[PDB]
Design a protein around this ligand. Structure first.
Ligand SMILES: [Ca+2]
Lengths: 222, 58
């Protein structure tokens, strides 16, 4: 997270860390048994770490649960970075508590202008901001017009831009799969962008609300 | 040594943090770099051995 601020410990209870030897992606706990992330963060088996704040220090609050299933959206396309969403089934259900609590799926799609929060342990592009400590950042959803103008022809229905055309604040490498929460609802999943915090190149996020059907049907299929 | 061993490592647009290896011709060493997770180029290997067997020399 570039240009953000350290989150108040445990203020983003749904925030998870995908580990496979080290932190490689983020994710969102949508319920005691499922986590939503990006399809490009796929791995046949991953360990999900919940209740984290500083990923490099044991805090007592954490839960390391292995995945039992990792399902990528069926229509995901790596070259287009299209339909960049996936679900991970926890081998043992998460214990919800003061540190581990799920995030609500979107009832409706959020409008351009909507202020949201994105968080993660990705690159901060700063020697002062410690990426091991969860970073938070408030970003507004941009209009499809500005989004498509920034990346001509690259924006599909499964995507939306959020950030600042002026640059300076954005999600970066290590933040993928992470949450974009607008008013208590999970609106997007950190996906891609050209560089990080570059003027004219805002971050692109997967559009969760256009996936409600697959999300729910899949979490019901065993 | 295939010519793709001389190209700079490419992180790509995705935002994951996946550690990969690439051949650094200036130092003549296979080193690590952060790959974003999509649109990988050829000077991008899963292990130092692959990198070495492929770009290590001629
Ligand atoms: Ca910790």
């Amino acid at each position: 997270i570039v240009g953000g601020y350290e989150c108040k410990p445990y203020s983003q209870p749904h925030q998870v860390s995908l580990n496979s030897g080290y932190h490689f992606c983020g994710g969102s706990l949508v319920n005691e048994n499922w986590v939503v992330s990006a399809a490009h963060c796929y791995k046949s088996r991953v360990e999900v770490r919940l209740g984290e704040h500083n990923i490099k220090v044991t805090e007592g609050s954490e839960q390391f649960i292995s995945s039992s299933r990792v399902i990528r959206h069926p229509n995901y396309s790596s070259y287009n970075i299209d339909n960049d969403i996936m679900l991970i089934k926890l081998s043992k259900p998460a214990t919800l508590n003061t540190y581990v609590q799920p995030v609500a799926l979107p009832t409706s799609c959020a409008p351009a202008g909507t202020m949201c929060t994105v968080s993660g342990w990705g690159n901060t592009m700063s020697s002062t901001a410690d990426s091991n400590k969860l970073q938070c950042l408030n970003i507004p959803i941009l209009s499809y017009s500005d989004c498509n103008n920034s990346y001509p022809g690259m924006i599909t229905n499964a995507m939306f831009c959020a950030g600042y055309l002026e640059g300076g604040k954005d999600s970066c490498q290590g933040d993928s799969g992470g949450p974009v929460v607008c008013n208590g609802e999970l609106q997007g999943v950190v996906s891609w962008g050209y560089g990080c915090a570059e003027p004219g190149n805002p971050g692109v996020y997967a559009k969760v609300c256009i996936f409600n059907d697959w999300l729910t049907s899949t979490m019901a299929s065993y | 040594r295939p010519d793709f061993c001389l190209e700079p490592p490419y992180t790509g647009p995705c935002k994951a943090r996946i550690i990969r290896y690439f051949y650094n011709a200036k130092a003549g060493l296979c080193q690590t770099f952060v790959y974003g997770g999509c649109r990988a180029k050829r000077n991008n290997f899963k292990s130092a051995e692959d990198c070495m067997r492929t770009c290590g020399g001629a």
